[PDB]
Amino acid sequence: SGRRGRHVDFGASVDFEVHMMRRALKPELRNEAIKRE
Amino acid sequence: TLKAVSIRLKSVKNIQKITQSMKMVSAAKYTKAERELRVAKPYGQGAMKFYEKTELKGQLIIAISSDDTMVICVGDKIRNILLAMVCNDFGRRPPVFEDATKVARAVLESGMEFTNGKIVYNAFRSVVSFRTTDIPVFSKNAIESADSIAAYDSLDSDVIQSYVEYSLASLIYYTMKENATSE
Amino acid sequence: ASDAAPLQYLAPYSGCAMGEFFRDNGKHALIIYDDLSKQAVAYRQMSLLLRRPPGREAYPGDVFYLHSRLLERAAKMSESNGGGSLTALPVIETQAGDVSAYIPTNVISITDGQIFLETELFYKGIRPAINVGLSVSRVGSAAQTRAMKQVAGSMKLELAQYREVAAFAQFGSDLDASTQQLLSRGVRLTELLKQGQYVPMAIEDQVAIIYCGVRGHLDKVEPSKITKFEKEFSQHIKTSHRDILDTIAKEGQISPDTDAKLKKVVTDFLSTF
Amino acid sequence: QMAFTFAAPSQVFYNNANIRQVDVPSFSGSFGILPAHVATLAVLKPGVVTVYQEDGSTKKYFVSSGTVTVNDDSSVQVLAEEAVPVENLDLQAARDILSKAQSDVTSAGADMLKLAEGQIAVEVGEALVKAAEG
């Protein structure tokens, strides 16, 4: 798709997907799931 | 003299206190690293399951550490001993998948072709024993040219490229967790 | 110092006789010898100039007998003998912390306990510089009120735990939550034990402030404001909840009902703090 | 009776657990896996994995991306980076993520990198909304 066509590997796509994944948990699991960088 | 013996005894007592404090810090870090390794070990076994099933056999070196064959270092210790990439300010924090993703991205986007590779890392044998070993790593061209890859369905160039990018990232993560626990 | 060595030798016995008059008359007396090392020096000079056989550090063979017959006169008399008492607080000045010197060894072996003041703690600003791990009292909790003994047993246990875990955790960060809790509790208790000069503060305020220290009430405030908490919170219970203090004084201990009352008072004061 | 290994850097869900069927959302289309399915490999997409345990219970797990490896011995190793249970999801945060993603798509302009980031975040936002509603 456009991911590999825009000179972007899959690993950066997973990083973008997970960075937009850990925010979908409001009450308590947001801080537990985040392990910084 | 009595004063010289007292000064030497106080110095050795201070040294023992420092080493015991570092032992307690290392014990806490080892307990945390073993707690994470209990989760991260089946993940690495699942990542190695594909290469175990395909039986890919037969360069590149990824040297895991802390602070003709192309060698890429992760940590300041290898640079102190010896350099395509050197990771600095590492080892003060436990490893995560973001670090393995950055390392695998830097390896694959380096523009250097490789057929076979190994990840020189210290695997965790026991509490007092750790063994320096390696994990085989194959590129896209080394996988597409394999004999068993014709038995694996729905494989185009994009799928295999994406698969080896993530499989390299997962293997680097598993080696980082075992190396951190061993260290 | 300008007085003769016989006067320095005689002054502790003169003061002991003055105290023993109160002891034998049914009254209670406290005597301070500041300090007994100067008396031992004066007796050493008199014994050397009297051609007596010296011993270790040129002290005579009865300096122990001198200090023991001085300090055995502090006693708690029986009720049939009047019921009076004499309490002795001898002072020993040591050189570079040499506890193993001859005169400090004798005085330590005579008395019922010692209070160690540390030069290192004094130069850190920790005043009073009492070394808790070196200070011993053989009478112990028998010499305490019910409320003070109740809180000080837990305070001594928590300070012993803090002393155990703070040697290897001077600046460690990757530690267990229990170790960080013990470090925080010990920091609160150590800042609580600090006290100014010429300000005694009665048994009730002392019991109240270290009860607040041991129940985790001060874990939510900065250590540098802990003395300011002492400046204010006691005044609050002197002007808002005098009935709680009256019930504590009536019962003599801290009941769980008074524990709940004091917890509510602390929470109310920390809300406005 | 399929050896379904489902792991992640954060958690391990199943380790050689016997599973009847797994519904994987992949980059080659959402396909289902049964015992002796096929020896394919796959690349995950933001979507929902449906797991059919041997007692008949059905469980769901949102996966951002990973690798799916169905081998010849009917062994499946789905390894996401951040796999969560679908019950641990926020619908309102999903809608906010999707709205911010569309805002980034609109405000990207001629920035192709931020355009790709906005497209990826749009896909994740759509998948999160559909999983939370589903």
Shape of chain C: globular
3D shape of chain A: elongated
- What class, by secondary structure content of chain C? mainly alpha
Count all strands of chain C and give the number: 4
Q: What is the tally of helical segments of chain A?
A: 3
Strand content of chain C: 5-15%
Radius of gyration of chain C: 23 Å
Content of β-strand of chain A? under 5%
Q: Which pair of chains forms the biggest interface, and how many residues does each contribute?
A: B-D, 26 and 27 residues
Q: Total strand count of chain A, please?
A: 0
**Spatial sequence of strands, sheet with the most strands of chain C:** 1-2
Radius of gyration of chain A: 13 Å
Level of helix content of chain C?
40-55%
What is the N-to-C succession of helices and strands of chain A?
HHH
Biggest sheet overview of chain A = none
SSE ordering of chain C: HEHHEHEHEHHHHHH
Indicate the multimeric state: part of a larger assembly
How many angstroms separate the termini of chain C? 52 Å
Characterize the biggest β-sheet of chain C. 2 strands, parallel
PDB class: membrane protein
Keywords: ATP synthesis, Complex V, oxidative-phosphorylation, membrane protein
Entry title: Artemia franciscana ATP synthase state 2 (composite structure), pH 8.0
Chain A: ATP synthase subunit epsilon
How do the strands and helices of this protein lay out in sequence?
The structure is cut from a larger assembly and holds chains A (37 residues), B (183 residues), C (273 residues) and D (134 residues).
Chain A: H1 2-5, H2 10-19, H3 29-33
Chain B: H1 2-54, E1 60-64, E2 70-74, H2 76-81, H3 97-108, E3 116-124, E4 130-133, E5 136-138, H4 140-144, H5 157-182
Parallel strand pairs in B: 1-2, 1-3
Antiparallel strand pairs in B: 3-4, 3-5
Helix pairs in contact in B: 1-5, 3-5
Chain C: H1 5-24, E1 28-33, H2 36-49, H3 63-71, E2 85-90, H4 102-110, E3 113-114, H5 119-123, E4 136-137, H6 146-165, H7 177-193, H8 203-214, H9 226-237, H10 242-251, H11 256-271
Helix pairs in contact in C: 1-2, 3-4, 6-7, 6-8, 7-8
Description:
- The PDB classes it as membrane protein.
- Keywords: ATP synthesis, Complex V, mitochondria, oxidative-phosphorylation, membrane protein.
- Chain A contains 3 helices and no strands.
- Chain A is mostly helical.
- Chain A is elongated.
- Chain B is an alpha/beta fold and about 180 residues long.
- Helix content of chain B is about 55%, strand content about 15%.
- Chain B is built from 5 helices and 5 strands.
- In chain B, strands 1, 2, 3, 4 and 5 form a 5-stranded mixed sheet that branches.
- The N and C termini of chain C lie far apart (about 50 Å).
- Chain C is globular.
- In chain C, the strands form 2 sheets. A two-stranded parallel ribbon of chain C has the order 1-2. In chain C, strands 3-4 form a two-stranded antiparallel sheet.
- By secondary structure, chain C is mostly helical.
- Chain C has 11 helices and 4 strands; from the N terminus they run αβααβαβαβαααααα.
- Chain D contains 2 helices and 9 strands, in the order E-E-E-E-E-E-E-E-E-H-H.
- Chain D is elongated.
- Classes of the chains: A mainly alpha (about 35), B alpha/beta (about 180), C mainly alpha (about 270), D alpha+beta (about 130).
- The interface between A and B is medium-sized, with 10 and 16 residues.
